Amino acid sequence: AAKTEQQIADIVNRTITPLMQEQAIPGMAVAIIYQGKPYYFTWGKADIANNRPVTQQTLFELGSVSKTFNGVLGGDAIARGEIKLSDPVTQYWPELTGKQWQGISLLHLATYTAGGLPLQVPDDVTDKAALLRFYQNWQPQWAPGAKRLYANSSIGLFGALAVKPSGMSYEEAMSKRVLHPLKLAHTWITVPQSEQKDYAWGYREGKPVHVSPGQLDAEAYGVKSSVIDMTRWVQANMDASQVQEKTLQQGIELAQSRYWRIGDMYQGLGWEMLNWPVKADSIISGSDSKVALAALPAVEVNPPAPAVKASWVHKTGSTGGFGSYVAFVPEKNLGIVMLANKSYPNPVRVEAAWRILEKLQ
Numbered sequence: 001a002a003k004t005e006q007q008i009a010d011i012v013n014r015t016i017t018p019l020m021q022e023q024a025i026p027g028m029a030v031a032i033i034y035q036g037k038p039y040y041f042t043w044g045k046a047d048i049a050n051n052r053p054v055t056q057q058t059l060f061e062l063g064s065v066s067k068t069f070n071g072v073l074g075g076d077a078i079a080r081g082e083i084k085l086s087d088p089v090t091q092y093w094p095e096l097t098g099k100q101w102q103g104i105s106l107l108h109l110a111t112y113t114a115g116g117l118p119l120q121v122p123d124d125v126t127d128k129a130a131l132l133r134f135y136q137n138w139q140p141q142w143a144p145g146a147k148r149l150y151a152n153s154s155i156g157l158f159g160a161l162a163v164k165p166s167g168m169s170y171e172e173a174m175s176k177r178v179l180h181p182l183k184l185a186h187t188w189i190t191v192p193q194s195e196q197k198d199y200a201w202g203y204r205e206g207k208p209v210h211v212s213p214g215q216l217d218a219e220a221y222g223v224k225s226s227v228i229d230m231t232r233w234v235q236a237n238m239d240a241s242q243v244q245e246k247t248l249q250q251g252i253e254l255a256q257s258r259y260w261r262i263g264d265m266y267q268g269l270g271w272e273m274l275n276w277p278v279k280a281d282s283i284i285s286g287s288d289s290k291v292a293l294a295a296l297p298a299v300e301v302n303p304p305a306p307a308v309k310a311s312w313v314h315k316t317g318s319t320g321g322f323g324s325y326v327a328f329v330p331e332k333n334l335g336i337v338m339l340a341n342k343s344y345p346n347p348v349r350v351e352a353a354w355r356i357l358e359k360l361q
């Protein structure tokens with residue numbers, strides 16, 4: 001039976017109540033899409049100290065959910081015939097000399113299968129003069145297409161390279177090409193002076209903290225957004241037909257296309273999918289630092305496989321003071337946006353995201 005807001009309210013309240021409680025979270029913003037209808041919930045505060053609560057306009061740092069944007073942005077550019085996954089990395093950054101790079105294409109970067117590019121850029125690399133040196137001296141652990149090693153410095157470099165052709169900086173392309181078309185008027189990279197009053201404080205050992213500047217920050221973990229906006233983003237990704245821009249639409253279709261298989265999990269652009277129906281255990285345990293962050297053997301699906309409605313699309317993200325999670329089942333038109341201003345364990349988030357959902361399918 002078609003759940004009623006109050007039965008929906010029951011599940012969500014039932015689940016999140018105790019989470020915040022035991023994970024010691026200050027404020028939370030969660031959204032459920034139940035039969036493609038948005039239902040919003042918000043608990044606690046955005047600012048402990050200045051006693052301001054979690055609003056449906058409150059801005060949360062998305063950490064690595066930022067990557068979904070990067071991947072769709074790259075997909076739009078692909079559709080426009082501006083870039084090609086197969087394109088040599090050199091093509092976009094000729095200055096970047098050194099034979100370690102010759103067989104490394106845009107797919108490698110996008111999908112973290114270049115040869116073990118690190119999870120983060122040595123923050124002693126705080127300028128672009130230094131980002132090239134870094135990449136100039138990098139030493140691959142494995143030949144391309146061998147292992148899969150989640151990394152900011154990988155996809156981060158894709159984002160930055162993928163907008164080269166267009167002549168816009170990343171922030172500008174992002175805005176113009178994805179954010180404006182979708183009407184994400186509350187989704188920022190550089191939060192205006194005007195919006196600072198809606199920008200939550202992330203908590204870390206009781207300290208209020210905002211994500212610091214960082215080479216490739218924007219492209220891998222620097223997008224700020226609100227649960228209203230996150231829900232529209234999920235809605236658009238969960239079904240692209242609604243998208244009027246031809247290129248942005250295809251782009252979304254591209255980022256949810258399957259490029260590699262890493263045992264039961266498939267890799268798109270930013271987005272990671274699983275065949276549905278899915279084993280709670282697979283995704284609750286595959287989300288663990290120990291699997292998620294490990295170098296694993298990947299099976300090249302090339303030509304890529306096409307976005308199928310019976311998949312479990314999703315993406316996790318963290319930042320000092322922030323924990324974020326997004327999941328959606330295209331086929332069932334269900335989704336969930338969980339935004340918290342305190343970083344907590346991944347599989348916690350993911351198991352919570354499952355309890356609810358499970359209850360609504």
Ligand SMILES: *C(=O)[C@@H](NC(=O)/C(=N\OC(C)(C)C(=O)O)c1csc(N)n1)[C@H](C)NS(=O)(=O)O
Binds near residue numbers: 063152318319320321
């Ligand atoms: C994305 O959320 C991403 N996070 C990072 O790369 C950073 N921190 O996360 C861990 C816990 C791994 C870290 O200490 O580095 C990060 C970037 S800016 C900031 N304040 N933290 C990770 C690696 N992927 S996720 O989707 O599994 O969280």
